[PDB]
Specification:
With about 180 residues, the protein is an all-beta fold. About 0% of the residues lie in helices and about 35% in strands. The chain is built from no helices and 13 strands. The structure holds 4-(furan-2-carbonyl)piperazine-1-carboxamide. 4-(furan-2-carbonyl)piperazine-1-carboxamide binds next to loops. Belongs to the TRIM/RBCC family. It comes from Mus musculus (Mouse).
Length: about 180
């Protein structure tokens, strides 16, 4: 693809993080802690899942960023409405304000309702995410496989400002401790 020139510098918003997440000083990496991270609760924090938002809000234009997923067993990535539900149980779907893909149990799926099987021959170590606000498009690219397309959500109805969305996943197995990292431009 040729979206690299719309690169944006994303940083994580501490205040939105689940209370078990550890965000690096530079706000560019996040991982699951082995306990509560000694923060106060607030209405912004994702309560049920190890999720966090980017600080940046997008309401126009074209935006591109990359995320490192090396050696993780489980994760969710994409964008969401600024006003998504934070508390309790919910599914990742466009009806709920999310445009996401994930890894779970050795398969990759797009967060449609119901979910869509992805066809990935080369397991990605870095994922590229492209958003065209006006066109209503969110696309995912396999940076490890020369930028090959993973999935395109089209005819998106954003219905609000968008925020970068992350889920580091649980670490029940002891094999999913590795961080998500925002990769340099
Ligand atoms: N039933 C709804 O009201 N939906 C919310 C908006 N939708 C989308 O943004 C979308 C993009 C790709 C697939 O769905 C469709 C689902």
């Amino acid at each position: 693809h040729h979206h690299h020139h719309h690169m944006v510098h994303i940083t994580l918003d501490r205040n939105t993080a689940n209370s078990w997440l550890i965000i690096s000083k530079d706000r560019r990496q996040v991982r699951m802690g082995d306990t509560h991270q000694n923060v106060s609760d607030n209405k912004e924090r994702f309560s049920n899942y190890p999720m966090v938002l980017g600080a940046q809000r997008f309401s126009s234009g074209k935006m591109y960023w990359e995320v490192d997923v090396t050696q993780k067993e489980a994760w969710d990535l994409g964008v969401c409405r600024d006003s998504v539900q934070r508390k309790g149980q919910f599914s990742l779907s466009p009806e709920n304000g999310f445009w996401t893909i994930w890894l779970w149990q050795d398969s990759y799926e797009a967060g449609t309702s119901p979910q869509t099987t992805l066809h990935i021959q080369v397991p990605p170590c870095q994922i590229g995410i492209f958003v065209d606000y006006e066109a209503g498009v969110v696309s995912f690219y396999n940076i490890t496989d020369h930028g090959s397309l993973i999935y395109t959500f089209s005819e998106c109805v954003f219905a609000g400002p968008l925020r970068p969305f992350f889920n580091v996943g649980f670490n029940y197995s002891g094999g999913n401790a590795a961080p998500l990292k925002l990769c340099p431009l």
